[PDB]
Design an enzyme around this catalytic site. Structure first.
Site, short mmCIF file in Angstrom:
data_model
loop_
_atom_site.label_atom_id
_atom_site.label_comp_id
_atom_site.label_asym_id
_atom_site.label_seq_id
_atom_site.Cartn_x
_atom_site.Cartn_y
_atom_site.Cartn_z
N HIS A 189 0.26 -0.98 0.07
CA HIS A 189 0.15 -0.10 0.03
C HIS A 189 0.72 1.27 0.20
O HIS A 189 0.07 2.06 0.10
CB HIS A 189 -0.70 -0.44 1.17
CG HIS A 189 -0.20 -0.22 2.40
ND1 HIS A 189 -0.60 -0.82 3.86
CD2 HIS A 189 -0.01 1.86 2.72
CE1 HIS A 189 0.20 -0.12 4.19
NE2 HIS A 189 0.42 1.20 4.30
N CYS A 243 4.43 1.82 8.92
CA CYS A 243 3.88 0.83 8.27
C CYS A 243 5.57 0.22 7.72
O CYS A 243 6.10 1.06 7.25
CB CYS A 243 3.01 1.08 7.21
SG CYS A 243 1.32 1.34 7.94
N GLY A 298 3.19 6.06 9.32
CA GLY A 298 4.18 6.18 9.09
C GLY A 298 5.36 5.30 9.55
O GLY A 298 6.59 4.33 9.19
#
EC number: 3.4.19.12
Lengths: 306, 306
Positions: free
Chosen positions: A41, A145, A143
Site C-alpha cells: 500500500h 508501516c 508512517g
C-alpha cells in the site's frame, strides 16, 4: 535474578531498515541482499485505501517511481514485483550489512521483538506476542508501516512480521515476509472484525514458573487438578485449552522447580476463580501471557547471540 | 497508536561490548576509543568479595593479567588504572565502532535502556528506571556485571549506568561510568540496606496523559485539587512530593490533551484512595511509574535516531 520483558538486541535489524517513497506515501522497507521488502500500500494515496485495485495501481508504476533511501545513500531500482501483499523492489547493490536470515511464519502465542521505525530510522524496540486472534497490541504511529518483527537464534535473524495497518479498534495487523496476512485481514481501509481473543494459557503457566524461580511463591497451593477439569475452568474464563503438547513443553521448567504441571494448573485455577486479592506476581497485578516457555528459559539461563 | 514500554535501538552499544577476564572472573566491559571500562571487582575471587582491599589487590596485577576479548579479536592491554569503582584498561587499538558518546550521571526518576550481556555478547534489551532509592529492578544473572544502561539523543549515546551487584534483597545497584555508585552502596558482599522506596509521582502523571491520548479515559473526574492538598495524599501513599518544576515539565502534555495538571492530580488522588475497581489503564492493573514525561512525548510523536 529478576524478570523483565526483554527484546532481542536489534543491531542486526537496524542495518536493514530503509525508507521507501512512491509518489506521496513514505514508509519503511527491509533491505536484504539486493531486494527491498515493504507493504504494497505504499502505492496508494489516501482515497485509494478505501477500495484499492492493487494490480491496476501497480501498472501505473515503473521502476523509477520508487525512491529507496538508506541513510543518505540512494539505491537504484531495476525490478519490481508484487507477492501477495508485499512489494519486492529489486535494487542494484546488495546490502553490505545483510545478516544471516530466515523468513518464518509464526503461530499464535509465539512472541517476537518489534523494531518500530519512522522514515527508515529505528525509534525503539519492544517484545510482543501474536494474539490468538492474529492481532498484535503494539505501538505504531503514522508512517510506522513496514516495521518488522523478528526472533534471533544466535547468528540468524528469523523475520516473522511486517506491520501493515491499525484496525479501527486500535489493534494492529500485518503479514509474514511472504506477504500473507496473519488472520482474516486485508489491506483496505474498512471495518474489519478481529475475532474473540483469548489468553495464552501455556504462556501464563510459563510465567508462574518464572515467578517461583524468582522467589514469588504466595500462589502455590496444596490442591491439584486434572487436565479435563482444568480445561472446564479455562473456557469459563476465556483461556486456551491446555493440551498434552503444552504439558510437554513445560517439562524442563517443571524439572528445575520441582512443581508438576498439573499442580501449577491448580494454582492457576484458584487465581482465576478468586483473583489476586490485591497482590502482585513479578510486579504485575494481572496474569501475564506474553512470555513463552522458551522465553522464560532463555532469560533464566542467560542465552546470548552475536 | 498504542503504548508500550520501549527501549532504545541497541546497535550503537552492541559494537562496544567486550569480555574481560582477570584470573578466574569474567564479565562484560565497554570498549570506547582505546579504553575498556569494567567493574573493578573483576579482580576478586569469591572470598575476596567478603572484604576486598582493592588497592592491594590491583597491585598484584600487571597489564598482561587482563584478558580482553571482542568477538574473537584479542586486544593488547598497555595501561590500567582504577577510577573510583571502575577499571580503565588502556588498550592499543581504538574501537572502530565507537559511536559519538557522553558519560552522564542521571537523577532518580529518569529512565534508560539496559543491554544485558553475558561473556561480552548481548542477550536482550529493556527499559527501566532509577528508583528514588537509587536501585534498579532489572534482570541480571551471574556474569551480567558490566552491562551498561544508556539513552540515545539522535546520534549520541549517553551512558549512564554500569551494573555491579545484586543486593541480598534481589534488587540491583551500580555506578555511573566514572565509577561512583548510585546510592549508598559499595562493591562488597555484605548486607546493604536500600532505603525506603517511593513512587515517581511525575512519571505516573505522564502515564495518565498517555492513557488519555490513547482513548483510556474512565479515570477522568469532575473534581480538582490544590498542589499542597495533593501532596498530603501523596505522602499517605508513598508518592514523591509534586513540585512546580514537575508541573512545568508536564506542560506540553497538558497542552496537547487540554486537561490541566491539577485536574489530572485530582484523578490520581481518587485512584489512590479508591483503587482501580478491578479495571485497567493501558493494559495495567497498577499505576505505572516507569515512563518520564519525555518518554511519553517521544513515543506519542515518533522521534527517531540513527
Amino acid at each position: 535474578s529478576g524478570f523483565r520483558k526483554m527484546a532481542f538486541p536489534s543491531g542486526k535489524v537496524e542495518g536493514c531498515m530503509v525508507q521507501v517513497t512512491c509518489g506521496t506515501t513514505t514508509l519503511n522497507g527491509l533491505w536484504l541482499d539486493d531486494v527491498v521488502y515493504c507493504p504494497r500500500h505504499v502505492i496508494c494515496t489516501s482515497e485509494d485505501m478505501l477500495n484499492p485495485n492493487y494490480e491496476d495501481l501497480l501498472i501505473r508504476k515503473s521502476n523509477h517511481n520508487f525512491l529507496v533511501q538508506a541513510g543518505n545513500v540512494q539505491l537504484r531500482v531495476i525490478g519490481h514485483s508484487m507477492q501477495n501483499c508485499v512489494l519486492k523492489l529489486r535494487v542494484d547493490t546488495a546490502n553490505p550489512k545483510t545478516p544471516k536470515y530466515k523468513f518464518v511464519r509464526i503461530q499464535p502465542g509465539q512472541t517476537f521483538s518489534v523494531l518500530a521505525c519512522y522514515n527508515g530510522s529505528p525509534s525503539g524496540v519492544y517484545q510482543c506476542a501474536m494474539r490468538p486472534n492474529f492481532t498484535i497490541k503494539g505501538s505504531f504511529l503514522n508512517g510506522s508501516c513496514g516495521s518488522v518483527g523478528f526472533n534471533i537464534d544466535y547468528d540468524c535473524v528469523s523475520f516473522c512480521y511486517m506491520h501493515h495497518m491499525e484496525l479501527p479498534t486500535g489493534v494492529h495487523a500485518g503479514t509474514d515476509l511472504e506477504g500473507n496476512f496473519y488472520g482474516p485481514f486485508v489491506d483496505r481501509q474498512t471495518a474489519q472484525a478481529a475475532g474473540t481473543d483469548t489468553t495464552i494459557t501455556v504462556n501464563v503457566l510459563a510465567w508462574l514458573y518464572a515467578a517461583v524461580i524468582n522467589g514469588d511463591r504466595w500462589f502455590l497451593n496444596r490442591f491439584t487438578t486434572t487436565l479435563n477439569d482444568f480445561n472446564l475452568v479455562a473456557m469459563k474464563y476465556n483461556y486456551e485449552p491446555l493440551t498434552q503438547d503444552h504439558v510437554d513443553i513445560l517439562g524442563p521448567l517443571s524439572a528445575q522447580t520441582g512443581i508438576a504441571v498439573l499442580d501449577m494448573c491448580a494454582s492457576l485455577k484458584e487465581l482465576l476463580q478468586n483473583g489476586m486479592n490485591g497482590r502482585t506476581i513479578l510486579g504485575s497485578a494481572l496474569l501475564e501471557d506474553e512470555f513463552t516457555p522458551f522465553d522464560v528459559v532463555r532469560q533464566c539461563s542467560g542465552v546470548t547471540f552475536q
